[PDB]
Structure 1
């Protein structure tokens, strides 16, 4: 498999460093991982093999690794560190030997500092006078795996599970170690290794039969500062506990979970906790607080956390009833429960109120629960964004969500401030991303999708990083510093999401995908289903009326500033118009386009743009190794051909329904 962004490509003779020793003040597993990474990077890039020592040699050029407590003289900069995972990197200002100090608040801080130092070297930065201080914004920077133990991965487009096979754990762990290195390099500090939809075999991950293996995996992740979590089956008491119910208020059920927690911590002392998708609490007339709190109480004595997913809605909605709105479900179910959740419970909410569509407005829940920890869930695997066949760099979208001002406490109440816990002083909060990896040699199916995993980690560490700099870092580390290569791949990445949205669902209405696998155009795919995902297109217009005045009243879930913006047909942003209003095809957008012509325009032009992505990539031939050049070219060609299908299906569907021809007379099949 590929090293992804940790290539540590050999430098030319004019870009090397002179170091004789690495001073490791600690011998903990995390320090060993940090030292090993430093040795690997310096050897591959610099062709040097500094000796690892435990005390500084005042006359040797060295890289010093330690925590504040290991310092001889604690300087002001590192003295300002408050976050456990924070660190400082600074070059000694003396005129003698060259010394680089990597000072972490804790061991994990040293590890992240080493990765940062190595990132600087891969990017060819001048490290003669460094003065860096970094502290992560989000406490939880997590990855959710949807891997099944039979090897399949739900919504996995990059191969099979690297964790399981034949209802067992894989015997080889070398790839898990390399995966841990990739995650740690971008600051990811938490991971749930199994599908949130817990099946028969997976339910047993919390039993003695599989805990030894879970512990072996946790041991590897622990060395890289990563806490391990398990997704659980709420009905476990029944399925494997032999109890007659799973009711969270049943005494025996409560005790069963306490005993289960105790058992897990005997194998994994620093177990992170449970990720829960939920026989469930409502099966017994209990609410989410009662259901989550029961699990929270079981984990409390051990410091474990309960990550309760808010992806709850009536999966049996009637398309006939336009008064019911799936988009309102999450808020209506959890908002009223604010303040009733135990302190170690974190509500995990998707970026949008529906289901990871190419574009969805921000979930109203963010900013609405001052007394309840919250963390956002984003999807790295491209379920509705191309399935790694189409290129789609998700970082720009995630920044739009993170930078969305909820106005919960007036201007300056961005989503990022909600989930980083600063706005409401949340004890536990952060962000989680659904893994896009698999057994494929390139890990992500589409070589360029590696940028989404890298980018997720970067944003999790600091949401303020620009999409531009994240793309630049990833391209340089993965493909080198040739200015043409960097500018071209960066442009491809930065423009990809808009290009894909252009030829898929219009103006934020979402969906229009084939049911089941969710890949490809099918305008009415779920239009008459019971999933609550409708566009209501007819011969005169299209869109969901989510207004308070005449619609579902969904706009009222936002604070006044945003509620008013979406409520008004005139101020509602074009990009989300059809998610909030039902309008005639002739309605004029802010862009000046009628709604119907906008549909035609973006679909015809989106294909043209996809062809440009391919053309620009082809111009890089000779500057990229043949293997990756062809791997990506193959996918770009697949993208162009499928984009044509998206364009024609959508254009024809709307021509057949609206009867309005393309303004420019471009080809729409009858």
Structure 2
């Protein structure tokens, strides 16, 4: 195996007793419909059932045979219509489905039924997933519908095909041969995403290139959209707010200028002439040298609404990305609550800083009550070790979605807020920055596939656990052997926390080398902005560490609902895993463990390395259950991870020691090298990413 199939591995069921049972239950595949989407579902079931059941199962439209899988909607399949599903289908809406073992004219059947063709597609993938994961079909009766409307992936891909925060190869999109060459991989990409119910893609970098709106590129993009359409995936583009100027058509991009308004309306007309079901726009504006409305003295609602007005006649939406930097997004956007148009959705990262290994929830989610919102999670491992560290992100996503905000009573979880139940809003969604590439296994590190998987599962149902998604993924990707699943599932579940522990435990954050983000640099000071440095966030000194965000410091806690401000502001109740986000504490503060804060910091850094070492031992125990190639690859990558984790640990412990002046407790292995040595390693250790200039650095001392 080389990862190309990801979790859609349609190999014969290994449990021979179970295989025989499936073979008895599904002897035929009945498909009456013939739309592109139903055809895609039929093709997936034909290849999937044939592979899993080890016999030729061909989709046919013929008189119903005993022991058939029958798929369709009441509108395209008279067999489905005859069951008179009624209210049972009503609950499923536009994208849901019902899977059920039943009878049609005394024939034994399993149905995949829906209101829409895309619901049939999603249900077909779930039916395959039940078999892939060795679940029984006898007495099957289940229905499901997605809990969020816009379930999207994001690709930070430059048109030169280098991917920003891209650790898995070049951009999938081969502009040089588009629109002429419809590569099979474009269809495989659509299959991967549709298998999770992902229904949208933003294919181009948020650091946006205006060329994507030119005819030259719209023709190429349309060819991708055509490949994606049968699988239910709408096309979206990141836009450059200054495009009217870049195209030399208008001497300003001010959204209140009628010529600018018209430029975008005319451009939307052009887009929809190529892509009649185009989803809309992703916008990064006035952030990091990206142009925006504030460049013309206008606010973000004025800019978003101008774009939204251009898209509204075509049914498009705008995904608008949202002294103490922690306070920034909330302070910028809270005054605009209620000012955005109904087809604008504010796309907000899980936390207020930037995808750090642990962040508290973004206060905007509990504060904006009159604005559509959507979550943005990161899959690509910008902060979790590129393609060389194993870091299943399921637990990060779950932790986020199940976080209680107390916005409006108990049950105001991030997930319930996203679903729209808390504040009663129109558009809902989640976006996942996946940044795959042309590597054979799409994601570089095999385990990044598990993070993509969990994100799509959770976008469908935000209460799905990291454990459940890992169990599925492991079954689908590797093995159904219980003795494999349990230890590898636990290895996955600990991997995120390991990555917190050897980098920045206890509420520490932003300790990375700038701007490449591969390795440690907790000493970083003196950049163009203080909030780019590490020292700004940790504030370590001889007496203590941490950033005071209570009422006696920046009072960022007042940005949160009262119950959260209260819990996090009191040392007696604040979780230790967030503590240094909100409190500057003396090194002698005693933690729950009985250690002082210095000792606890050291313990966590050393624990992260030990957790990696334990993952290595776990993986080595699985040799009998995994193919030799992927086995060897993951074993090797875990060796790289352990070496880097040691570098992280030694770099940060020695750095913080240099500031606190306390000894590393004697039981721990003392670093043989000094802090200067680790500063030298930070300057000289290869940064394994094509995009960031640090990978080209010739510094050797």
TM-score by length of 2: 0.90
Equivalent residue for 2:602? Answer: 600
Structure 1 contact 231–274 (Cα < 8 Å) conserved: yes
Shift of 1:94: 7.1
Equivalent residue for 2:140? Answer: 130
Equivalent residue for 1:294? Answer: 306
Q: Which of 66, 76, 86 pairs up with 2:72?
A: 66
What is the rounded CA distance, in whole Å, between the counterparts of 1:167 and 1:144 in structure 2?
22
Equivalent residue for 1:47? Answer: 54
Q: Does 1:284 align with 2:296?
A: yes
Shift of 1:198: 1.1
Equivalent residue for 2:691? Answer: none
Equivalent residue for 2:107? Answer: 97
What is the rounded CA distance, in whole Å, between the counterparts of 2:370 and 2:109 in structure 1?
46
Structure 2 contact 505–605 (Cα < 8 Å) conserved: no
Shift of 1:160: 1.1
Structure 1 contact 148–164 (Cα < 8 Å) conserved: no
Equivalent residue for 2:542? Answer: 539
What is the rounded CA distance, in whole Å, between the counterparts of 1:504 and 1:602 in structure 2?
9
Structure 1 contact 112–184 (Cα < 8 Å) conserved: yes
Structure 2 contact 46–58 (Cα < 8 Å) conserved: no
Structure 2 contact 178–223 (Cα < 8 Å) conserved: no
Shift of 1:664: 4.1
Structure 1 contact 514–520 (Cα < 8 Å) conserved: yes
Q: Does 1:623 align with 2:625?
A: yes
Q: Which of 232, 237, 240 pairs up with 2:247?
A: 240
| 1:444-491 CA distance string (max 9 Å, x none) | 111111100011001111111121111100001111112222112211
Q: Does 1:663 align with 2:673?
A: no
What is the rounded CA distance, in whole Å, between the counterparts of 2:527 and 2:580 in structure 1?
18
Shift of 1:51: 4.0
Q: CA RMSD in A?
A: 1.8
Structure 1 contact 162–170 (Cα < 8 Å) conserved: no
What is the rounded CA distance, in whole Å, between the counterparts of 1:32 and 1:256 in structure 2?
39
Structure 1 contact 20–51 (Cα < 8 Å) conserved: no
Shift of 1:54: 3.3
Q: Does 1:196 align with 2:206?
A: yes
What is the rounded CA distance, in whole Å, between the counterparts of 1:470 and 1:367 in structure 2?
27
Structure 2 contact 479–625 (Cα < 8 Å) conserved: no
Where in structure 1 are there 5+ consecutive unaligned residues?
311-323
Equivalent residue for 2:566? Answer: 564
Shift of 1:297: 0.2
Equivalent residue for 1:463? Answer: 462
Shift of 1:439: 1.1
Task: Classify the secondary structure of the residue corresponding to 1:330.
Answer: helix
| 1:93-113 CA distance string (max 9 Å, x none) | 579432011111211110000
| 1:71-91 CA distance string (max 9 Å, x none) | 123235633424210100000
Task: Classify the secondary structure of the residue corresponding to 2:376.
Answer: strand
TM-score by length of 1: 0.94
Shift of 1:153: 0.2
Task: Classify the secondary structure of the residue corresponding to 1:551.
Answer: coil
What is the rounded CA distance, in whole Å, between the counterparts of 2:490 and 2:59 in structure 1?
41
Q: Cα 1:564–1:95, aligned 2, differ >3 Å: closer, same or farther?
A: same
Q: Cα 1:570–1:282, aligned 2, differ >3 Å: closer, same or farther?
A: same
Q: Which of 310, 321, 324 pairs up with 1:309?
A: 321
Q: Cα 1:122–1:336, aligned 2, differ >3 Å: closer, same or farther?
A: same
Shift of 1:50: 3.4
Q: Does 1:118 align with 2:132?
A: no
Task: Classify the secondary structure of the residue corresponding to 1:22.
Answer: strand
Structure 1 contact 416–463 (Cα < 8 Å) conserved: yes
Report how many aligned residue pairs link the two structures: 652
Structure 1 stretch displaced more, 186-195 or 614-623: 614-623
Structure 1 contact 607–640 (Cα < 8 Å) conserved: yes
Shift of 1:610: 0.7
Equivalent residue for 1:320? Answer: none
Equivalent residue for 2:356? Answer: 357
Equivalent residue for 1:632? Answer: 634
Shift of 1:235: 0.4
Q: Does 1:17 align with 2:23?
A: yes
Instruction: Show the 5 A alignment for 1:169-180.
Output: 171=181, 173-180=183-190
Structure 2 contact 83–104 (Cα < 8 Å) conserved: no
What is the rounded CA distance, in whole Å, between the counterparts of 2:342 and 2:521 in structure 1?
44
Structure 1 contact 527–536 (Cα < 8 Å) conserved: no
Shift of 1:425: 2.3
Equivalent residue for 2:689? Answer: none
Task: Classify the secondary structure of the residue corresponding to 1:347.
Answer: strand
What is the rounded CA distance, in whole Å, between the counterparts of 1:151 and 1:45 in structure 2?
36
Q: Cα 1:575–1:566, aligned 2, differ >3 Å: closer, same or farther?
A: same
Structure 2 contact 148–428 (Cα < 8 Å) conserved: yes
Q: Cα 1:56–1:579, aligned 2, differ >3 Å: closer, same or farther?
A: farther
Task: Classify the secondary structure of the residue corresponding to 1:375.
Answer: strand
Shift of 1:604: 1.5
Shift of 1:63: 1.2
Shift of 1:529: 5.2
What is the rounded CA distance, in whole Å, between the counterparts of 1:56 and 1:435 in structure 2?
44
Structure 1 contact 296–342 (Cα < 8 Å) conserved: yes
Q: Does 1:88 align with 2:98?
A: yes
| 1:286-327 CA distance string (max 9 Å, x none) | 0000000000000000000000000xxxxxxxxxxxxx1111
Task: Classify the secondary structure of the residue corresponding to 1:366.
Answer: helix
Structure 2 contact 304–344 (Cα < 8 Å) conserved: yes
What is the rounded CA distance, in whole Å, between the counterparts of 1:429 and 1:167 in structure 2?
35
Q: Cα 1:306–1:384, aligned 2, differ >3 Å: closer, same or farther?
A: same
Shift of 1:170: 9.0
What is the rounded CA distance, in whole Å, between the counterparts of 1:65 and 1:393 in structure 2?
34
| 1:329-354 CA distance string (max 9 Å, x none) | 10011111011100000000000000
Shift of 1:622: 3.0
Structure 1 stretch displaced more, 520-529 or 483-492: 520-529
What is the rounded CA distance, in whole Å, between the counterparts of 1:509 and 1:121 in structure 2?
43
Structure 2 contact 348–373 (Cα < 8 Å) conserved: yes
Structure 2 contact 163–435 (Cα < 8 Å) conserved: no
Instruction: Show the 5 A alignment for 1:330-349.
Output: 330-349=329-348
